[PDB]
Design a protein around this motif. Structure first.
Motif, PDB file in Angstrom:
ATOM      1  N   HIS A 121      68.661  84.559  80.373  1.00 56.91           N
ATOM      2  CA  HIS A 121      68.759  82.892  80.382  1.00 56.91           C
ATOM      3  C   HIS A 121      67.371  82.602  80.516  1.00 56.91           C
ATOM      4  O   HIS A 121      67.368  82.227  81.995  1.00 56.91           O
ATOM      5  N   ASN A 195      68.023  86.961  89.574  1.00 50.84           N
ATOM      6  CA  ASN A 195      67.715  85.293  89.147  1.00 50.84           C
ATOM      7  C   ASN A 195      66.514  84.987  89.235  1.00 50.84           C
ATOM      8  O   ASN A 195      65.494  85.299  89.960  1.00 50.84           O
ATOM      9  N   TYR A 197      64.049  81.506  89.427  1.00 51.70           N
ATOM     10  CA  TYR A 197      64.203  79.992  89.977  1.00 51.70           C
ATOM     11  C   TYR A 197      62.943  79.341  89.555  1.00 51.70           C
ATOM     12  O   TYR A 197      61.943  79.925  89.692  1.00 51.70           O
ATOM     13  N   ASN A 236      73.261  74.826  86.380  1.00 49.72           N
ATOM     14  CA  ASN A 236      72.263  75.531  86.919  1.00 49.72           C
ATOM     15  C   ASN A 236      71.322  74.800  87.569  1.00 49.72           C
ATOM     16  O   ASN A 236      70.148  75.231  87.768  1.00 49.72           O
ATOM     17  N   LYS A 247      67.987  77.353  87.709  1.00 49.40           N
ATOM     18  CA  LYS A 247      68.253  78.694  87.518  1.00 49.40           C
ATOM     19  C   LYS A 247      68.304  79.349  86.418  1.00 49.40           C
ATOM     20  O   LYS A 247      69.144  78.943  85.434  1.00 49.40           O
ATOM     21  N   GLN A 249      68.038  83.690  84.403  1.00 54.98           N
ATOM     22  CA  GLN A 249      68.601  85.235  84.516  1.00 54.98           C
ATOM     23  C   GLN A 249      67.956  85.989  83.802  1.00 54.98           C
ATOM     24  O   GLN A 249      67.371  85.567  82.586  1.00 54.98           O
TER      25      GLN A 249
END
Ligand code: NA
Ligand SMILES: [Sm+3]
Ligand SMILES: [Sm+3]
Length: 295
Positions: A121, A195, A197, A236, A247, A249
């Protein structure tokens, strides 16, 4: 998949614009830069015409990526691999009259450790954005890392050739006996999730009852309002004072040697023989060569 962060912040401004007029006038305006009309049960037909001042790129000003980082997500999954035969040697006490404690040679293996990641992602931030994530390997006994590129579908693979070595072991070999030591490298792998960020700043520009020609408010406050109201899908995104955190992934995997097992066989009667002992031996790791690639 990818999140176009700048375009979503522009939609955030459009959501606040439309939602706020909908409260003021009981209209059903949608987030848009286009002129639109709507029937208010309390006001009649009402028009929303965003001026050039705020539309398109000018929905957001002072857009900035402030920081980016990546953290281990959940519990990674570790597995054991097929053991790899590393070699053998003989401990010959066939001519001895005394039991002996005989030292084995060192065994070795030339192994390619690999770490790879995939951005699953991605975050389209308008600038190349990377972050390094660290994770424990081999049941928490070492630390490894991997660098994500936040663009959707980015893949990285890093390899190191290493030499693994088993220290010499002391084996009791009885008088008149001949023993064979076989060595195997045990391997492991790990895979998991990360994750991704980014902390981003900006000012959202909207026409509003108090600012009919347009006014700007920091995106953190505008996001806080829009999430409280249910205006738009920003699942997100998270407010962080005047900024927002977005966020994404990734996934990762890694493989490595874990230790050596030595298998001791009695071959006196001469041709595999009876296993007499097995020893787990911690390996000694020495890097030789390294190679980086990104796709
Ligand atoms: Na949009
Ligand atoms: Sm989670
Ligand atoms: Sm997970």
């Amino acid at each position: 998949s990818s999140t176009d962060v700048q375009e979503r912040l522009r939609d955030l401004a459009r959501e606040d614009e439309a939602g706020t007029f909908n409260e003021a006038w009981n209209t059903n305006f949608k987030p848009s830069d286009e002129q639109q009309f709507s029937y208010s049960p309390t006001e009649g037909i009402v028009f929303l015409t965003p001026p050039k001042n705020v539309i398109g790129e000018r929905r957001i000003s002072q857009y900035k990526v402030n920081n980016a980082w990546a953290t281990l997500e959940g519990s990674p999954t570790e597995a054991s691999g097929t053991p790899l035969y590393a070699g053998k040697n003989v401990l010959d006490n066939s001519k001895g009259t005394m039991d002996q404690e005989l030292l084995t040679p060192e065994f070795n293996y030339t192994y390619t450790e690999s770490t790879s990641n995939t951005t699953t992602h991605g975050l389209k931030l308008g600038v190349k954005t990377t972050a390094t994530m660290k994770f424990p390997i081999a049941q928490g006994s070492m630390e490894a890392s991997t660098e994500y590129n936040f663009q959707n579908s980015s893949t990285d693979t890093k390899t190191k050739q290493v030499s693994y070595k088993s220290p010499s072991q002391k084996i009791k070999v009885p008088a008149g006996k001949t023993y064979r030591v076989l060595a195997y490298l045990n391997t492991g792998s790990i895979s998991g999730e990360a994750n991704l960020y980014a902390n981003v700043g900006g000012i959202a520009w909207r026409v509003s009852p108090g600012y009919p020609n347009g006014g700007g408010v920091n995106i953190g406050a505008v996001l806080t309002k829009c999430q409280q109201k249910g205006w738009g899908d920003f699942r997100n995104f998270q407010p962080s004072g005047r900024d927002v955190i977005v966020k994404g992934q990734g996934t990762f995997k890694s493989n490595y040697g874990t230790d050596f097992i030595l298998k001791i066989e009695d071959i006196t009667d001469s041709g595999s023989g009876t296993v007499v002992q097995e020893i787990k031996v911690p390996l000694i790791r020495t890097e030789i060569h390294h190679h980086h690639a990104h796709h």
